[PDB]
Amino acid sequence: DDFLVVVHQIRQLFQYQERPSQDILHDKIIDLVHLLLRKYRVKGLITKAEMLGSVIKNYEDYFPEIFREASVCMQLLFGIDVKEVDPTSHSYVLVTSLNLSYDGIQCNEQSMPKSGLLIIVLGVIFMEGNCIPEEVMWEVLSIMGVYAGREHFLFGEPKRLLTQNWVQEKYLVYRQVPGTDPACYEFLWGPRAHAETSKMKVLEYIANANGRDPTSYPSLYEDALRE
């Protein structure tokens, strides 16, 4: 599909409790996202001068917009943050969002970062009160085009990714629901999730996705303070 379509759908997904068009600027944002993904993989530094030279060229006057849109894509789609390390040379580095120690690449140049989807899953569990029926998780993920039993063009097979990979990584718990027979399944945060982030940091990420303040999620804000 399209990186920016999926970004738009991720912002919809986070509003579940309440479209990009093809032009030159769209192409310049995708090309920059590709360049930023290349630098992330080798922890390469990138400058504003490199971004102009290799991608922006004759759209220098749209640089602020293209960089902002590309930076939003890197975060919400790939869980990569763009951080300024030198204001004078306009030098930036690419690090994993919420400082998670996982991106699912594992020195593999096919693989797309999975930290974006991991943060969304942790968010959704949080959003449903820190324990979510499996079927409700799949319903919410359907909003961003992620489906159990279907190969996803960025993230691979989500059913295995959530119930296997992220259980073995201890980001998630996936278990039989107590009192159910025959058996239903639920997700919670795993111990690595609690060790690497907090409810309030995840609420801020969620809120920021749609330009909203965390306080505008009153129940989730109160739950995040209970920590």
Numbering used by the authors: 680 to 697, 706 to 707, 1218 to 1424
Pull verbatim passages from the article behind this deposition:
Melanoma antigens (MAGEs) are a large (>40 in humans) and highly conserved family of proteins present in all eukaryotes. Conversely, MAGE-D, -E, -F, -G, -H, -L and Necdin subfamilies are type II MAGEs that have broad expression in many tissues. Both type I and II MAGEs share a conserved domain known as the MAGE homology domain (MHD) involved in protein–protein interactions. Growing evidence suggests that MAGEs function as substrate adapters for E3 ubiquitin ligases (reviewed in Lee and Potts2). Recently, we reported that MAGE-A11 drives tumorigenesis through ubiquitination of the 3′-mRNA processing factor PCF11 resulting in alternative polyadenylation (APA) of transcripts and 3′-UTR shortening (3′-US).
Thus, we expressed and purified the PCF11 degron sequence fused to the MAGE-A11 MHD (S218 to C-terminus) from bacteria and solved the crystal structure to 2.2 Å. MAGE-A11 MHD formed two winged-helix motifs (WH-A and WH-B) conjugated by a linker loop, where each WH motif contains three alpha-helices and two beta-sheets. However, the extreme C-terminal residues of MAGE-A11 formed three alpha-helices, whereas these residues are unstructured in MAGE-A3-MHD and MAGE-A4-MHD structures. Of particular interest, the PCF11 degron forms a short alpha-helix that binds into a shallow cleft formed at the interface of the WH-A and WH-B motifs. PCF11 binding to the MAGE-A11 SBC is largely mediated by numerous hydrophobic interactions that extend along its helical core and capping residues. I689 and L692 of PCF11 form a hydrophobic core with L273, L274, I317, M341, V337, I340, and L338 of MAGE-A11. Notably, the N-terminal capping residue F682 of PCF11 interacts with F275, F350, L351, H231, and V230, whereas F693 at the C-terminus interacts with I317, I403, and A406 in MAGE-A11. In addition, a key polar interaction network enhances binding; R690 in PCF11 forms a water-mediated salt bridge with E266 in MAGE-A11 and is further stabilized by forming a hydrogen bond between the NE2 moiety and the backbone carbonyl of A406. Furthermore, disruption of the hydrophobic core of the MAGE-A11 SBC by I317R or M341R ablated PCF11 interaction in vitro and in cells. However, the most variable residues are concentrated around the MAGE SBC, suggesting that these are likely key positive and negative selection filters that dictate substrate specificity across the MAGE protein family.
